[PDB]
Ligand binder design. Structure first.
Ligand SMILES: OC[C@H]1O[C@H](O[C@H]2[C@H](O)[C@@H](O)[C@@H](O[C@H]3[C@H](O)[C@@H](O)[C@@H](O[C@H]4[C@H](O)[C@@H](O)[C@@H](O[C@H]5[C@H](O)[C@@H](O)[C@@H](O[C@H]6[C@H](O)[C@@H](O)[C@@H](O)O[C@@H]6CO)O[C@@H]5CO)O[C@@H]4CO)O[C@@H]3CO)O[C@@H]2CO)[C@H](O)[C@@H](O)[C@@H]1O
Ligand SMILES: [Mg+2]
Length: 293
């Protein structure tokens, strides 16, 4: 559903494995005590400051409290909420940080976001996939059975491809016929659903235009026309989705017949089978990542 997080019911979480918890945000310094009691040695926080300010959480008091103890480490590795693109872009570095933390700290690892429904499950699932050796859909089935969430499989598949093959960007042009509009924006795409970017009305063209450089993948977006959310009937669209919403999408493709394009196709299937040389390459990347601080 649309609004499932209930901050007032306090920090909540599930063991995915005995050594790996996915949970919602710590709310008070005393929540550090709760995690120490179950053998948590790393608190891996994905929230940004506005997420914390929205719910009145004082992250500084939590960090200061955790520093009193030598048997738990609090780490901030920030990812924007409601932004599958930022998630795709951040996953490699974030999982690298987590990889180094778990190696150094051991015990139980507590991976959290605001709700523990999007970013934290995505990060934990990517860690199970790249580090712990699970097949992606094997880990996904396990995760979904332990905690109801929305773990952003498309972001994970794309981050994996980004590490293995690199990012190739091209100019994408989105356009909307004017019907006496004062303002036209797009949300979603590469900026997230919490953000909007204005289009320009072409002088004497009768059309609003946006040009953006995007890497390969499929990007859902929607127009805001004088403040009203609208999908453009003249561009590709998908839905209604679960939540009853229809979005436009931009499908960006480099070259399907190339070696990298052939790899992308294999890794974009539901359960992307990694070669062992690809697993070794993911670990090589993680090993280069700097430790928290
Ligand atoms: O942090 C502040 C925030 O906290 C709470 O949010 C948390 C929430 O309670 C909890 O459930 C969770 O959210 C989940 C969510 O439940 C899942 O459904 C899921 O959401 C994604 C959704 O399934 C995707 O479709 C997507 O939605 C886009 C649509 O695709 C767009 O079309 C667009 O929708 C607009 C629509 O088109 C218009 O016709 C009009 O109806 O307006 C809509 C916009 O309001 O935008 C939405 C996104 O807004 O993307 C969704 C996000 O990925 O996955 C979620 C977790 O990722 O976790 C929340 C914290 O992350 C609290 O309830 C909120 O009130 C508060 O703002
Ligand atoms: Mg190459």
């Amino acid at each position: 559903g649309s609004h499932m997080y209930r901050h007032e019911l306090g920090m909540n979480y599930n063991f995915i494995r005995p050594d790996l918890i996915v949970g919602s945000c710590l709310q008070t310094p005393e929540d550090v005590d709760k995690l120490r009691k179950i053998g948590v040695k790393t608190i891996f926080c994905l929230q940004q400051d506005p997420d914390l300010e929205y719910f009145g959480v004082d992250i500084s008091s939590i960090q200061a409290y955790a520093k009193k103890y030598s048997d738990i480490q609090h780490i901030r590795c920030e990812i924007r909420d409601f932004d599958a693109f930022d998630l795709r872009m951040r996953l490699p570095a974030v999982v690298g940080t987590l990889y180094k933390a778990v190696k150094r700290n051991g015990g139980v690892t507590y991976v959290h976001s605001t709700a523990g429904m999007g970013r934290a499950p995505a990060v934990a699932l990517t860690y199970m996939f790249w580090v712990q050796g699970y097949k992606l859909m094997e880990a996904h089935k396990l995760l979904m059975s332990k905690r109801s969430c929305f773990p952003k499989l498309d972001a994970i598949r794309n981050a994996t491809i980004d590490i293995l093959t690199g990012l190739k960007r091209k100019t994408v042009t989105l356009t909307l016929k004017d019907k006496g509009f004062s303002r036209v924006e797009i949300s979603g795409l590469d900026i997230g659903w919490g953000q909007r970017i204005p289009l320009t009305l072409d002088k004497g063209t009768g059309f609003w235009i946006l040009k953006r450089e995007l890497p390969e993948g499929q990007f859902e977006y929607k127009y805001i026309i004088d403040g009203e959310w609208t999908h453009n009937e003249a561009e590709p669209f998908i839905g209604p989705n679960k939540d009853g919403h229809t979005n436009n999408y931009a499908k960006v493709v480099d070259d399907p017949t190339s070696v990298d394009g052939t790899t992308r196709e294999r890794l974009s299937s539901e359960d992307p089978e990694l070669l062992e040389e690809e697993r070794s390459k993911l670990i090589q990347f993680l090993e280069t990542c700097s430790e928290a601080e």
